[PDB]
């Protein structure tokens, strides 16, 4: 079926989403991989991961928005209020054509297409409205152990490979708003606007500093000024279960994107039954091709600054980015 804009879709029920996609790219993200995009991507996780085989939750159901009055009381959802201040108006204005679970997954898929190198993901629709808030304690925290993280993702059907890719890849295009005291938009990698493998490098370096004037639980030292490091990421890069996977993505941008894309789609299905869903992948914008060069060490760092953790292979012999040590700019906030 050809929609009013000229897009061909397999299922004409998808055409009603074309204006949503246009509104998101023009008016929420404004064609940029900035804070609005980061918030939409984070919201995918906080909505979808909040499901457990034994404790409940509906998964990718829109509960984080519909039942925000409850879910925003949960410590792990700190800062989701500010994300919803930017994204929530769009969810409401498009609530005539799609459920909130569908909206959140669409917005995350469209957000990725605003970022250099990020994959175009598959997108399906048909998720029913949510029944209840998620239980608390289903969203992983940055102070959770690797065993805890792997049990949560593993019990939901993710491989360790997918787990590392989706966490680390997301953190390629992301900052911390509620970790560094009184500071917002502190990136996890040197390039929060670029879906590259700098995150994997940046985290493997020996940490030497903390930004700002104190710490939050689940923060550790970082190696690059103007960035922050989560304990979870730190540990994922170093634990024997995951460290070789972490290392495997360094300077493997295409492989990391492919795995990331598949993991996001899997995440988008949590709590759902794939049988009742309709593919609307044609409505997703085209991706921006990765247009940067190889991964590099940050200025001033050398391979002796890498903390080797993978026993099977040495860390890749990357060149060092030329120039003086510089601080990474903070991300201007949408809210
Ligand atoms: C073990 C898993 C994870 C932990 C513990 C974790 C932790 C965090 C923390 C603590 C922040 C900062 C929040 C704040 O200061 O308000 C953050 C930011 C973010 N996370 Fe993760 N995260 C994980 C997985 C993921 C996944 C799977 C995705 C996406 C599907 C994701 C996407 C993001 C994005 C995009 C941001 C940046 C938001 C912004 O710039 O405003 N996270 N994460
Ligand atoms: Ca949910
Ligand atoms: Ca990056
Ligand atoms: Mn933010």
Author numbering: 1 to 335
The publication says:
Manganese peroxidases (MnPs) are, together with lignin peroxidases and versatile peroxidases, key elements of the enzymatic machineries secreted by white-rot fungi to degrade lignin, thus providing access to cellulose and hemicellulose in plant cell walls. The primary mechanism involves the MnP oxidation of Mn2+ to Mn3+ and the subsequent formation of chelates with fungal dicarboxylic acids. The molecular structures of Ape-MnP1 and Cst-MnP1, which share 50% amino acid sequence identity, are characteristic of ligninolytic peroxidases.
The refined structures of the two MnPs with manganese yielded near complete models. Thus, the model of Ape-MnP1 consists of 335 amino acids (from Thr1 of the mature protein to Asp335) and that of Cst-MnP1 includes 331 residues (from Val1 of the mature protein to Ser331). Besides the amino acids of the polypeptide sequences, final models, crystallized in the presence of manganese, contain a heme prosthetic group, two structural calcium ions, and a substrate Mn2+ ion, as well as 180 (Ape-MnP1) and 171 (Cst-MnP1) solvent molecules (with three Mg2+ ions from the crystallization medium also present in the Cst-MnP1 structure). Mn2+ binding was confirmed by anomalous difference electron density maps. As a consequence, using Ape-MnP1 and Cst-MnP1 as representatives of the subfamilies they belong to, we renamed both subfamilies as MnP-DDQ, with a manganese oxidation site made up of Asp/Asp/Gln; and MnP-ED, with a manganese oxidation site formed by Glu/Asp. It was surprising to find that the MnP-DDQ subfamily differs from previously characterized MnPs in two of the three residues involved in Mn2+ coordination, with Asp35 and Gln333 in Ape-MnP1 occupying the position of two glutamate residues in short and long/extra-long MnPs. Moreover, this is the first MnP subfamily described that includes a residue of the C-terminal end contributing to the Mn2+ oxidation site. The different orientation of the Asp35 side chain in the structures of substrate-bound and substrate-free Ape-MnP1, and the absence of Gln333 in the crystal structure of the Mn-free enzyme, confirm the mobility of these residues, a behavior that has also been demonstrated for the two glutamates of the Mn2+ oxidation site in previously characterized MnPs. Once coordinated, Gln333 also contributes to anchoring the C-terminal end of the enzyme, where this amino acid is located, restraining the mobility of this region of the protein. The kinetic constants of Ape-MnP1-Q333P confirmed that Gln333 participates in Mn2+ binding (a 172-fold decrease in Mn2+ affinity was observed for the mutated variant) but not in its oxidation (kcat was hardly impaired).
